[PDB]
Design a protein around this ligand. Structure first.
Ligand SMILES: OCCc1ccccc1
Ligand SMILES: OCCc1ccccc1
Ligand SMILES: [Cu+2]
Ligand SMILES: [Cu+2]
Ligand code: NA
Ligand code: NA
Ligand code: NA
Ligand code: NA
Lengths: 620, 620
């Protein structure tokens, strides 16, 4: 019955049929994005209407369409022809990944460049890289991909070990025209292989690792009902899946006594971007938005037991659309399980003689995705004590280049002649807040140091200050680690027993934000990435910090546009957008496959409860 | 045979006998600190000499002594009478914890103050709080404790729920004189109990938690030999225990092919301090150094299976001295085990078709200690990929006060009339570095942003810079989270295959450092806490950032004195001192017993290896 249930195969087939019948899904059409739309606000009316949003691409060169359909009524709600030079190109298709290599393989400029380097064209792989927006006039309104080459010596060879530097090409994937081929000069192609399964490279595998067994003889402490509704240790939520954002959490709430108390209405990673910091023309254009341009959900991995998720696991197998509207299941694409988390609370008291120890645990909801060379794990955690946390785990193979003779200020060396250009991985968490309901506000909290003097004669005092963010214009905030800056989301109309408004405190990692010059294309296209925290007023159509159509969009889209409305956010339905990321100067240890590195954020209750919420946890 | 073996009961008995025979341990003497001394530098001579350092207190008012003895030769190496007004008082004795309450119970001023508040003296507990150094002339050279009162309604009652504000007393624990009683006025004593085991407060315990079983059917992957030598997944180290610092790690090294490569010679938490930020005279003097003043090792908990350490556990049971020189075992005081740590490395490659997943694990060495109201877990982690990490877990019961009518800028409210003064918990990690040997240097690494212009026409470039710290005078460093500041410890004489010096990168959490005004007593006594990173030249007698005798020391001791020597640290035997801590504005959820909060740091290899060190990890 739940309006937050996962999309079904049947629903996806209905969308296909509705689209087909309406004349919108002929043979030259491709579905570039398809997702179910969340229930609308003020929906306490009881009138379920399952709607899906679709981006439809045309391979024959006709303009694409944005379409919303109702799978309840079988109707097309809206169908709008898009002007891509205006509002952006559609997300990259998986079926386009091979096109760049294929178009270049018969191009004389490209073959010439390969020939100079003595590379058999049959062995040259070409990365299908998003183009962004730079100085090339002919690219406006064209569906462009850029291509960088990597040699693959044999079918099972890791191409990333063999970048072809000094060469890049641009292709119109629709007209099938190679628009430009740029050769700045030959660089040696790194010769060492990067094959991390080769005994030559790995050496003899370890025999020292003894097994670790994690089991639950009574089964899990959480229940799953209605397909995706989770209940666990007072927590309640719905686990959604969208082909763009991946795992999405809905209706995060905590059972406090008799009350079901909302905390976050919707939590997602609404964008991620990987900007490169190498000023070489071969790569200075490169900034892929894995979420917005490539859609990380469609590449979610099937997670295998004992390997990806250890212990007592419950899987969801979300259904997506293929490029033709057929339902495709990602089997075991989402892991759900609880983990022991060490000590929760502990005290041995010298006066009462009481010794007390309780253990902690967390509910984990996760998926792993792959987009070319890079692979990410996305993890949401719910803790017994009311803490909510997200963690991204970055791994895969680093994007490579030549390492210049004489070195580089913007590239690191991984192996002889093999380079790794500097880059960032920057995420945006979109948190549709609902602290005890929708009437919320955000305060910026700073530590306040105090001067020695009257009222502080020993110079020991320190304090804190809170600044309420009242309007969107003043809600674009930056980190200040030195002054312990956090942000509190509170409900001014809902007070705890000490008569203070209930709250949750956001703790950032205070990692560097976007490093690019503010006049850069990427600073404009990824403006969200330039500040740590944004607060907006909720709106149905404000979904992504980068706007709906990120691919080849000229800039200013998303958050910087939304906040221009300068709406009231002081005791209103608001959305917090947190930017957090990793700045990556690759190390030799990252090669030839990268050990996981992590980044994320958490929120902890701040006077949300009237006392510790874990006093009723048993002794074990 | 190892010179790094744990102290034995027999060794401690030898120290007692040697001290007794030398006339240094008569009936009025107490051992305030006893610990074994690490092997000296340049010790490739093969001549074991187990030495112990002892601080000896006298309860009759005679001056204390610092004594070093050899348990090999049975000799007193040195015995020096201390002038405590000059160099500081000795650490607080456990047997002194009860003295403050006992002395005050027959004092007329104290009884008067209690009587005004209608508190039965039999029910009033008094915290034995370190005194620090302020304006009280009579305190120089006196062994003083300050006392704050808490009512305990019955034997098993949590006194912390019932602070007696507006009252503090000072006592000379040797002369048994109450020097001052200060009553600034009556505050209501908070009436609600804080008994977290009471069904009235906890409510019905949860029945929803299903068991989680962690077992190793083949046993652990690490070996323990020689009592405390650990070998695990290429790691090698010795686990020490000192009554002051607690668990200490020695000779951390990594087996890389045929080579045993040193990384850290000695790792410890060499000090921790908890400064309070309430300008009330009742508490404005309060800054306890749990390590330096109280000795956290002597209060290490006996850790029980299934409760404190879950899984396949191997315990050490370290031996310490009691106040009379008798050996006392802390049974199961140290936990050692390996934990699964999720995904280590993962890639599904679109061109090779190879799907690859490896799991991570970490070796954990930990202990838990209790000092009055507060309890801490100290955890060291070694990861498969070469990462070293420390984590402190803070729990117990928060130090309480009245909550002022009309509120407070320096105290938070936990319950009706119950306050929690603002404070910090600040740690100093002392890392005696040995990156591939003792010839080390430290660089400060900052991200460098670049301006759009010639050579960076698209404004996308960013870089990094490194600054070698050459002399101690310039090695006092502060965090800069905004510019991604880290510190690299390298060996300029040991290069990897790409001909770069091998290194390890320190990643700080960039939490606020000491907040007190720089003119404060605590800023002088805890100068280390005012900066994130110090580098010194190794010296035998430079052990603690606060000096040897922290209790009632007037200031300037430790690091600020050491760095005055302005020694060469560029390619030399050096020691890194990292300050990291939590700034605590207590929340209602922290009451009546605090959920664990954490803080720490890590180091990751930075071109230490010639490629990823975990390519030989099996597939599971
Ligand atoms: O991450 C998306 C960019 C990318 C896509 C395919 C191959 C390499 C890189
Ligand atoms: O943490 C050391 C200070 C302290 C000691 C004993 C009781 C309360 C506080
Ligand atoms: Cu990276
Ligand atoms: Cu605290
Ligand atoms: Na445009
Ligand atoms: Na909201
Ligand atoms: Na002095
Ligand atoms: Na050293």
């Amino acid at each position: 019955a739940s309006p937050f249930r996962l999309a079904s195969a049947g629903e996806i087939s209905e969308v296909q049929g509705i689209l087909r019948t309406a004349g919108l899904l002929g043979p030259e059409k491709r579905i570039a994005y398809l997702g179910v739309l969340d229930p609308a606000r003020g929906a306490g009316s009881e009138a379920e209407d399952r709607r899906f949003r679709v981006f439809i691409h045309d391979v024959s060169g006709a303009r694409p369409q944005e379409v919303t359909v109702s799978v309840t009524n079988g109707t097309v709600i809206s169908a709008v022809e898009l002007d891509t030079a205006a509002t952006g190109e559609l997300p990259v298709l998986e079926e386009e990944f091979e096109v760049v290599e294929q178009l270049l393989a018969t191009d004389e400029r490209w073959l010439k460049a390969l020939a100079a380097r003595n590379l058999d064209v049959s062995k040259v792989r070409v990365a299908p890289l998003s183009a962004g927006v730079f100085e090339y006039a002919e690219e406006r309104g064209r569906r462009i991909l850029r291509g960088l080459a990597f040699v693959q010596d044999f079918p099972e060879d890791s191409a990333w070990a063999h970048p072809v530097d000094g060469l890049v090409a641009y292709v119109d994937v629709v007209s099938k025209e190679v628009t430009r081929v740029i050769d700045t000069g030959v660089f040696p192609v790194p010769a060492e292989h990067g094959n991390y399964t080769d005994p030559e490279l790995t050496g003899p595998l370890r025999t020292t690792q003894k097994p670790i067994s994690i089991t639950q003889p009574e089964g899990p402490s959480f229940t799953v009902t209605g397909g995706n509704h989770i209940e666990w240790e007072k927590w309640s939520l719905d686990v959604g899946f969208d082909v763009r954002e991946g795992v999405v959490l809905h209706n995060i709430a905590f059972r406090d006594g008799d009350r079901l108390r909302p905390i976050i209405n919707r939590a997602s990673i609404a964008e991620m971007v990987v900007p490169y910091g190498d000023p070489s023309p071969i790569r200075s254009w490169q900034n892929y938005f894995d979420t917005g341009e490539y859609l990380v959900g469609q590449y979610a991995n099937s997670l295998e037991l004992g390997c990806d998720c250890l212990g007592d696991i419950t899987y969801l197998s979300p259904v997506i659309s293929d490029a033709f509207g057929n339902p495709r299941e990602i089997r075991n694409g989402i892991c759900m399980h609880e983990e022991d988390w060490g000590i929760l609370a502990k005290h041995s008291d010298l006066w009462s003689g009481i010794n007390y120890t309780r253990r902690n645990r967390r509910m984990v909801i996760s998926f792993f995705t792959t987009i070319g060379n890079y692979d990410y794990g996305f993890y949401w955690y719910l803790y017994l004590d009311g803490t909510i946390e997200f963690e991204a785990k970055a791994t895969g193979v680093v994007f490579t280049s030549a390492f210049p003779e004489g070195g580089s200020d913007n590239i690191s060396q991984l192996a002889p002649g093999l380079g790794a250009p500097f880059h960032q991985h920057i995420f945006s968490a979109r948190l549709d807040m609902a602290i005890d309901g929708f009437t919320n506000r955000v305060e910026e909290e700073d530590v306040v140091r105090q001067t020695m003097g009257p009222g502080n004669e020993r110079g020991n005092a320190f304090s804190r200050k809170r600044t309420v963010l009242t309007r969107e214009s003043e809600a674009v905030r930056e980190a200040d680690a030195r002054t312990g800056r956090t942000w509190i989301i509170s409900n001014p109309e809902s007070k705890n027993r000490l008569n203070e408004p209930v709250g949750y405190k956001l703790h950032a990692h205070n990692q560097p934000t976007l490093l690019a010059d503010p006049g850069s294309s990427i600073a404009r296209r990824a403006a969200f990435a330039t500040k740590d925290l944004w607060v907006t007023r909720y709106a149905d159509d404000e979904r992504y910090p980068t706007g709906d159509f990120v691919n080849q969009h000229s800039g200013g889209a998303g958050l910087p546009s939304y906040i221009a409305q300068d709406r009231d956010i002081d005791g209103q339905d608001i959305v917090v957008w947190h930017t957090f990321g990793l700045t990556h100067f690759p190390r030799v240890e990252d090669w030839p496959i990268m050990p996981v590195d992590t980044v994320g954020f958490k929120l902890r209750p701040e006077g949300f409860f009237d006392r510790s919420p874990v006093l009723d946890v048993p002794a074990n």
